């Protein structure tokens, strides 16, 4: 995206650092959610809770991409 | 004339974001501990939901910093 960032380069180093840390966490989390998906439960409540977690994983993924684009455009 | 904000106000918003990041870290440590103390798919699911929300909060704090320091 365009240029013109107006904040500390030091923060831009460290925010990329934490975003990367958050991507690592996310991958490990999607691994845990995957495992939980196939490893065990026949209940409508249980199925719904798992779908809620699985959805939130995607929300977190898209927000990480949003934070990356905003970070390198800002 | 796009942005019109007081420098002191933007500095105090950066502080509030910092304090919220500290709260987040303490929250993630709290969850690491409580998760590590624990066979239920619901309980595991709630734990995964909390971990996700912590990740969401991380990304929104980074977004809030980026949007704040480009205003």
């Amino acid at each position: 995206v365009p240029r013109g960032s107006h904040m500390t380069e030091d923060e831009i180093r460290k925010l990329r650092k934490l975003l990367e840390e958050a991507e690592k966490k996310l991958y490990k989390l999607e691994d845990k959610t995957r495992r939980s998906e196939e490893i065990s439960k026949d209940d409508p409540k249980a199925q719904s809770l798992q779908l809620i977690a699985e959805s939130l994983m995607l929300i977190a993924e898209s927000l990480l991409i949003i934070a990356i684009s905003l970070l390198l455009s800002s | 004339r796009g942005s019109h904000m007081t420098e002191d106000e933007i500095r105090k918003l950066r502080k509030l974001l910092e304090e919220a990041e500290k709260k987040l870290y303490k929250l993630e440590d709290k969850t690491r501990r409580s998760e590590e103390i624990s066979d239920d798919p619901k309980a595991q699911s709630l734990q995964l939901i909390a971990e996700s929300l912590m990740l969401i909060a991380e990304s929104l704090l980074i977004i809030a910093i980026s949007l704040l320091l480009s205003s």
């Binding site: 030091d10 460290k14 | 420098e7 933007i10 950066r14 974001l17 990041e21 704090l61 480009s70």
Partner: peptide
Amino acid sequence: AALAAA
């Protein structure tokens, strides 16, 4: 994650 701006 810590900065000032104006």
